[PDB]
Amino acid sequence: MAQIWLWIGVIGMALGSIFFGIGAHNAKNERWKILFTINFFICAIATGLYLSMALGQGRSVIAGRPTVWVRYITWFLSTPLLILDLTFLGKTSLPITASLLGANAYMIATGFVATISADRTIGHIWYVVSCFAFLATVYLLVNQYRKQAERNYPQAKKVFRKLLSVHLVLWTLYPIVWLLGNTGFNAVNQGTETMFYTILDITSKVGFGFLSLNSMHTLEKNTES
Amino acid sequence: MAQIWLWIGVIGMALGSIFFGIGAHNAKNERWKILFTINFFICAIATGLYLSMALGQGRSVIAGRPTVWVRYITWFLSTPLLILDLTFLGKTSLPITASLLGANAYMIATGFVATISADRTIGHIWYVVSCFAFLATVYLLVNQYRKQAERNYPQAKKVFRKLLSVHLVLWTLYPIVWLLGNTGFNAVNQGTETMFYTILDITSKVGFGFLSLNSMHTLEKNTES
Amino acid sequence: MAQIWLWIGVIGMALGSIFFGIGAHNAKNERWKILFTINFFICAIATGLYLSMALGQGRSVIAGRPTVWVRYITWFLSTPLLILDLTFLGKTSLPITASLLGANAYMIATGFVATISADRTIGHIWYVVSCFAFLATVYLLVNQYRKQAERNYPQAKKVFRKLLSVHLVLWTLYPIVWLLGNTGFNAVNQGTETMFYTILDITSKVGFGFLSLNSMHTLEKNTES
Ligand SMILES: CCCCCCCC/C=C/CCCCCCCC(=O)O
Ligand SMILES: CCCCCCCC/C=C/CCCCCCCC(=O)O
Ligand SMILES: CCCCCCCC/C=C/CCCCCCCC(=O)O
């Protein structure tokens, strides 16, 4: 079960990479070329890292607990680019953009330590810290990020509402899967945990990538002379 | 002894993080929001890494020698932000800013290898190399950095004198502690070495952070219309 | 044989570092100071990493196969700066510059996994992936990169022709050495493989660095008023 869902992730990310790369090659406009290129690399990074996991790499048995630590490499590299999708679209200021990237990096870093710690009490402490880092990004996204975006695009508040709603709902699912998996309560087996993360990853990457392109199109139409 | 001083570092860095974060949230002005945000992340990174050390993590017994290798992660991430405090305040040029960040990264990288090498002869070679990297940053700071700062703020030469004096004196203490600790002569025990680095870290981070804010205030008063 | 060629690399890189550093210290002009500084750090990074290899570090016996994994650290840090030599000279756009840096990072990252994988079938898969990442950079260099450079310097198409010819020919030699060495067919012994990489590294770093300076001089003469 786990093995097929890793290959489904390879396929899904590779397809996202091809279609974003084609969009990048045929962009009209530097802004469009940038946005296609960000999403190309989100999906291209995830393709290679899903390929390593599918081939059996990036995994260690830590005190009896199978642990796919390479998952946190993918997340550390791709989540900042998703943040950049948002801040590129919202024309976010430099301090708020840096704060989002830093709090996000803090979340993935502490989530990684939460995962590879042999002492699961210590790991669960790091889980809580990582949740507070996520909550920091929630605060920044629904306050300073949102208000700048709505000031920059007064006619497209609904666009950023949908982007933020999809981002917040999807990203909140990751710490739930983490608690269900063998990092937490072990309420679901490894095949199910892997299926969950594969579906989340394809949705938060390919799915969010296509939503970012559709948002760009709406913003540019609302901004034509 | 070592254990309490790691917790003192957690407390000190967390307090610095809270007060710099509060300053960031209430900044008037993008320049002030940037400077508060740099110092927030300096202290927030150090808080998490001090928490890992306090919990017993980030440590390895290398050929019989207890070695807190995670100390070099904290330093690799936080020292460039301290460099940025300086170059942000001095409005340093891009080549000099990159040279300071690169020489600094070289220093921490070679200091890390100097520390984890089992062969302490090789480690001591890397210590010397790291000292020359530090000396490179000294040269850049008291020449090109200082002269640009004084050209940018002709009325505030004393401000950069104090910043540079505190930076140079404090940062020179780290290679002295390193020679005293079990990386070198082992003239002081691990509790004392840990106390020294905790006091240095709180001073060079929280202390220097507050000095950078006070300097900003002096520069802005000297620069009001 | 391997040992002397590692020391030859130390010497060659150190000499390149000194002469690029002297150029940086005596630059007239921010553009010249930037270009000297990029090449200084290319060679300074390679000096330190060649010193680690010469001292016997950065090497692991992976399932019976001696593997100098630190070679990929040098490459991950220095190859983006060589890309920057090119994009600095060509005044390349942000999306094309990011795509070159990302595809290049992808190449070195997958080349590293291709090297440290114990399963050499999996390693050879990663070799192919890394070759396609290289081919991606070839496509970007001879299409978008070249066309922007020739649009920016209509009178100096030959300058970018020589830069690209040297870059493409030299960099193609690395995957050939990799196939000849103990990562592939093991057709040459470790001393010969090390000699090959040392000569390639000195040429692609010091040699290309001096070519980038000579190109800058030609571009500036073709651009004087
Ligand atoms: C792989 C992605 C990692 C992202 C790390 C993000 C780190 C964020 C740190 C924030 C502090 C810097 C705030 C802005 C500094 C601006 C400096 C300047 O303007 O000179
Ligand atoms: C975590 C922090 C690490 C800091 C690393 C710093 C590396 C410094 C390297 C210097 C070489 C680059 C010099 C300036 C390049 C400008 C490029 C351009 O203008 O296109
Ligand atoms: C050590 C060097 C590593 C280099 C990594 C390069 C990663 C390349 C990734 C490309 C995606 C980003 C494309 C441009 C984003 C611009 C963002 C913006 O303008 O706000």
Judged by phi (left if over 0) then psi (alpha if -120 to 50, else beta), residue B51 lies in alpha
Helices A2-25 and A208-221, axial angle in degrees (round to 10): 30
Q: Please check whether residue C167 is in contact with residue C141, taking contact to mean a CB–CB distance below 8 angstroms.
A: yes
- Which of B30, B88, B216 most suits a substitution to test ligand 1, by most atoms within 8 Å of the C-beta? B88
What is the distance, to the nearest Å, from the Cα of residue C40 to the centroid of all Cα atoms in its chain? 13
Nearest to C112 by CA among C155, C168, C69: C69
Q: How far apart are CA A27 and CA A181, in angstroms?
A: 41
DSSP strands (E only) in chain A: 60-62, 65-67
Q: How far apart are CA A65 and CA A186, in angstroms?
A: 11
What's the CA-to-centroid distance between C34 and ligand 1, angstroms?
22
What contacts 24+ positions apart, CB below 8 Å, involve B64-71? Answer: B65/B182, B66/B182, B66/B190, B67/B115, B67/B116, B67/B182, B67/B183, B68/B194, B69/B112, B69/B115, B69/B116, B71/B197
Bridge partners, B67 (sequence order): B60
What's the CA-to-centroid distance between A102 and ligand 1, angstroms?
7
Place of tokens 């929280």: B206
B45 CB neighbours in chain A (<8 A) are: 106
Q: How far apart are CA C179 and CA C198, in angstroms?
A: 16
Q: Please check whether residue A107 is in contact with residue A130, taking contact to mean a CB–CB distance below 8 angstroms.
A: yes
How would DSSP label each residue in chain B? -HHHHHHHHHHHHHHHHHHHHHHHHT-SSHHHHHHHHHHHHHHHHHHHHHHHHHTT-S-EEETTEEE-THHHHHHHHHHHHHHHHHHHHHT--HHHHHHHHHHHHHHHHHHHHHHH-SSHHHHHHHHHHHHHHHHHHHHHIIIIIHHHHHHH-TT-HHHHHHHHHHHHHHHHHHHHHHHHSTTTT--S-HHHHHHHHHHHHHIIIIIHHHHHHHHHHHHHHTT--
DSSP H or E run through A175 = helix A157-180
Q: Please check whether residue A156 is in contact with residue A219, taking contact to mean a CB–CB distance below 8 angstroms.
A: yes
| Ligand 3 atom nearest to C80, measured from its CA | 2
Q: How far apart are CA C146 and CA C160, in angstroms?
A: 7
Nearest to B79 by CA among B204, B216, B207: B204
B57 CB neighbours in chain A (<8 A) are: 113, 117, 122
Distances (CA, A) of C57 to B3, B70, B114, C66, C70: 33, 20, 12, 12, 8
Which CATH number is B60-221's, of 3.10.20.30, 1.10.8.60, 1.10.10.10, 1.20.1070.10?
A: 1.20.1070.10
What contacts 24+ positions apart, CB below 8 Å, involve A97-104? Answer: A98/B37, A99/A140, A99/B24, A99/B37, A100/A137, A100/A140, A100/A141, A100/A145, A102/B41, A102/B44, A103/A133, A103/A136, A103/A137, A103/A140, A104/A79, A104/A80, A104/A133, A104/A137
Q: Which residue of A has its CA nearest to C109?
A: A48
The residues spanned by each domain of chain B are 60-221
Q: How far apart are CA A60 and CA A157, in angstroms?
A: 45
Nearest to C74 by CA among C213, C220, C202, C172: C202
Nearest to C159 by CA among C211, C206, C204: C211
Q: Regarding beta strands B65-67 and C60-62, do their DSSP bridges make them parallel or antiparallel, or are they unpaired? A: unpaired
C48/B102 touch (CB, cutoff 8 Å), yes or no: no
Q: Please check whether residue B33 is in contact with residue B24, taking contact to mean a CB–CB distance below 8 angstroms.
A: yes
What is the distance, to the nearest Å, from the Cα of residue C75 to the centroid of all Cα atoms in its chain? 7
3-class secondary structure, A66: strand
3-class secondary structure, A24: helix
Place of tokens 């210290």: C25
Token pair belonging to C16: 């390149």
CA distance A95 to chain B (A): 6
C33 CB neighbours in chain B (<8 A) are: 95
Q: Which residue of A has its CA nearest to B31?
A: A95
Q: Which residue of C has its CA nearest to A73?
A: C109
Q: Which residue of B has its CA nearest to A143?
A: B25
For B62, phi then psi, to 5°, come to: -100, 105
Q: How far apart are CA C6 and CA C8, in angstroms?
A: 5
What is the distance, to the nearest Å, from the Cα of residue C137 to the centroid of all Cα atoms in its chain? 13
For ligand 2, say whether the CB of B175 is within 6 Å of any of its atoms: no
CA distance C187 to chain B (A): 33
At a CB cut-off of 8 Å and minimum separation 6, what does B40 contact? B17, B20, B21, B23, B24
CB-hemisphere CA count at 13 Å for C111? 27
3-class secondary structure, C199: helix
Q: Kindly tell me the burial class for residue C63, based on how many C-beta atoms sit within 10 Å of its own C-beta (0-12, 13-18, 19 or more).
A: exposed
CA distance C74 to chain A (A): 20
What's the Rg (C-alpha) of chain A? 18
What's the Rg (C-alpha) of chain C? 18
Angle value at C-alpha C112, between C108 and C115, nearest 5 degrees: 135
Place of tokens 């890189």: C13
Token pair belonging to A168: 């917040």
3-class secondary structure, A173: helix
Token pair belonging to A140: 């920044």
Q: Regarding beta strands A65-67 and A60-62, do their DSSP bridges make them parallel or antiparallel, or are they unpaired? A: antiparallel
Give chains near C: 3+ CB pairs under 8 A.
A, B
Q: How far apart are CA A210 and CA A204, in angstroms?
A: 10
With an 8 Å Cβ cutoff, the interface of chain C facing chain B consists of 24, 30, 33-34, 37, 41, 44-45, 48, 51-52, 55-57
Homologous superfamily of the A2-216 domain (CATH): Rhodopsin 7-helix transmembrane proteins (1.20.1070.10)
Produce one character per residue of B197-218: b if its CB has 16 or more CB atoms within 10 Å, e if not: bbbbbbebbbbbbebbbebbeb
Cα torsion C75, C80, C84, C86 to 10°: value is 60
CA distance B106 to chain C (A): 8
What's the CA-to-centroid distance between B105 and ligand 2, angstroms?
11
Angle value at C-alpha B176, between B171 and B177, nearest 5 degrees: 95
Nearest to B181 by CA among B76, B67, B74: B67
Q: Please check whether residue C81 is in contact with residue C42, taking contact to mean a CB–CB distance below 8 angstroms.
A: yes
How would DSSP label each residue in C152-184? H-TT-HHHHHHHHHHHHHHHHHHHHHHHHSTTT
Neighbours of A81 (CB within 10 A): 21
> Which of C34, C44, C48 has the CB atom closest to B95's CB atom?
C34
Q: How far apart are CA B38 and CA A133, in angstroms?
A: 17
Helices (H), chain C: 2-25, 30-54, 70-90, 94-116, 120-140, 146-152, 157-180, 190-202, 208-221
For ligand 3, say whether the CB of C98 is within 6 Å of any of its atoms: yes
Task: Dihedral sign for Cα A197, A202, A208, A209, please.
Answer: positive
B52 CB neighbours in chain A (<8 A) are: 113
Neighbours of C64 (CB within 10 A): 7
Ligand 1 atom 7: the closest Cα is on which residue?
A102
Token pair belonging to B154: 């002709």
Token pair belonging to B95: 């080549």
3-class secondary structure, C123: helix
Ligand 3 atom 10: the closest Cα is on which residue?
C98
Token pair belonging to C113: 């996994």
Instruction: Tell which CATH architecture fits domain C2-214.
Output: Up-down Bundle (1.20)
At a CB cut-off of 8 Å and minimum separation 6, what does C130 contact? C106, C107, C108, C110, C111, C114, C175
Give chains near B: 3+ CB pairs under 8 A.
A, C
